Amino acid sequence: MFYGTVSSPDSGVYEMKIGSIIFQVASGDITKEEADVIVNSTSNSFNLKAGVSKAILECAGQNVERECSQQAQQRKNDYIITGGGFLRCKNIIHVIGGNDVKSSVSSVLQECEKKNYSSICLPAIGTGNAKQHPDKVAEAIIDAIEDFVQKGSAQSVKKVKVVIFLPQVLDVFYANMKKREG
């Protein structure tokens, strides 16, 4: 109903259409990416500095760290939105790695439509300190995008890219894409 064909447009990058959205996966360092939104996978305190979250907060800088801890004290949040600091993005959306990954990605997509943003980059949310299993994470991320497209919600969002630090986790995402292809 929604899925195109898996191909490789550039070395180490694999992509397929999901409705009107280009879905891409690659291995590498997420802090080197440019997108309207970059997603951080953190703790329920929004102050984790381990693995991908260490790289994101160190490269974003101390003003972003401070914005996180100010919002965390204000109310109980499922996720928080900050500026991008010294990352190449307009906003960082910090999601809780231990939460339901489908729910987290659905929230990211909705917030990007509210801002008329076109591009998103995320890590393999929950596979670091939260220790969620990589094929459950892949299934949940791609399911969230399919649901968003099925509801007719994709308008401004055009590109969703997962940049994955371990090549072995990239292999799991690729297999999940191939299972779905038209």
Ligand X SMILES: Cc1nc2ccccn2c1C(=O)NCC(C)C
Stretch that binds Cl ion, among 12-20, 67-75, 86-94, 156-164 (CB under 5 A): 156-164
Question: Which is closer to ligand X, CB of 21 or CB of 97?
Answer: 97
Report the interface residues with ligand X, using CB under 6 A.
29, 31, 51-52, 55, 165
Q: Which of residues 12-71 bind Cl ion (CB under 5 A)?
A: 41
| 41 interacts with, out of ligand X, Cl ion, none, CB within 5 to 8 A per kind | Cl ion
Q: Tell me whether residue 120 or residue 169 sits nearer to ligand X (CB atom).
A: 169
Which sign does the torsion angle of CA 72, 33, 24, 53 carry?
Answer: negative
Residue 149: Cβ-neighbour burial (10 angstroms; 0-12, 13-18, 19+):
buried
Considering the complex, state which of residue 148 and residue 173 has its C-beta at the smaller distance from Cl ion: 173
**Tokens for 102?**
């489908």
Please, is 138 exposed, middle or buried when counting C-beta atoms within 10 Å of its C-beta (0-12, 13-18, 19+)? buried
Residue 38 pairs in a beta bridge with: 92, 121
Kindly tell me which residue out of 128, 134, 144, 154 binds Cl ion, with binding defined by CB under 5 A.
128
For residue 181, the SS3 value is: coil
Residue list, annotated binding site: 29-30, 41, 52, 126-130, 165
Residue list, annotated binding site for a glycoprotein: 29-30, 41, 52, 126-130, 165
